[PDB]
Structure formats: structure tokens, C-alpha cells
Amino acid sequence: PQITLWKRPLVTVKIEGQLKEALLDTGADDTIFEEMNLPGRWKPIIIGGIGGFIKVRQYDQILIEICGHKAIGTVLVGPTPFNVIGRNLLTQIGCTLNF
């Protein structure tokens, strides 16, 4: 799908059987979600952005189906204001910017 940027690029994702909306965020290197249960071993890390840094849990090789496209990669869990799909997963669905 082609997506214009007049509104936030929020898509519906299926992750761990749960339905969530997330931002397709080209300014995010990695994917991060609100608090939720995910499988496998995790490690506490600390990501930062505009204004400061948060503590999250890094889960590896997590599956997400993003607007009907499947991707596997690292998903971080923690107090993010929005779920964001970052470049680590955007690449896997072959997402590009065009102008």
C-alpha cells in the first residue's frame, strides 16, 4: 500500500495474537511497543529519543504481521507513548520512502 503522510501512518498489526495499532516510523531504528507479554528470553536495555531515555525489555526474533505483511525481528517493550514500527522491521516488509 501507498501511504501519504497527511495523517499519522498508523497501521494495524498482529503480534502475539494481539491486535495493535503502530506507527510506521522511519525515524526509529528499532521497534517498540507498550507493555505486553512476549515469548523468549529478554534483556533490560535503555533507549533514548527526544527529551530523554526509557527502560525497556528487548525481545529477539519476534513475529509481527504489519498490515498483512509478516516480519521477524527485535521488539522492545516499555513506556513508549506510541507503538512504533522501526527500521529493523520496516526493511523486512520492503518499506521505502518516495518523493
Added chain:
Amino acid sequence: PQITLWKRPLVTVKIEGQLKEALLDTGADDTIFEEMNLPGRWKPIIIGGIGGFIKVRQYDQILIEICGHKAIGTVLVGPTPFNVIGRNLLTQIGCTLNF
């Protein structure tokens, strides 16, 4: 141009005679640059990111020339870690996400 997301989507920008690289950021509603001077009056505002908020100066009707495409709109100036071109200006160059 078509831009893949394996690397950060940086582009060279010309703004008020200055050359800068800025992140094509589809998760940013607004455009913000590190400290610089700009024409016109400005109003202080607060913006919030993943882990906190920052005090920035808001400028309106600022000319930005992004990768050879021109746009005019709001530009915020504050202690951002990376210059980001938000949707308020991505929309003006006809930028779209495609996958």
C-alpha cells in the same frame, strides 16, 4: 528518489543559507532542528518524545530545501539529538511510504 530503510534516511538540507543533514521522520508530526537562528518571530513551545520533553522555539513559514525539493512551514529549534523532517514538511514534497 526512492529511499530504502536499511540505513538511516538522512538527506542534505539547505535552510537559511545553512547546509544540514536531517532525518526523514514519518513518526515526527513536526520538524525540529538543533540550535540555529531563523527569520521571523518565535513562540516557545514544548514537544514530547519517547522518554521526555524539551523546550523549543517555534518558527512559522520557514523555507527548507530538502534534497532539491522546496517546502515552507513550521520549524522548531531546540536541543534535539538529530535534525528531523516531520510530516508537516514531508507532506509538502509529496513524500509517501510504500511497501
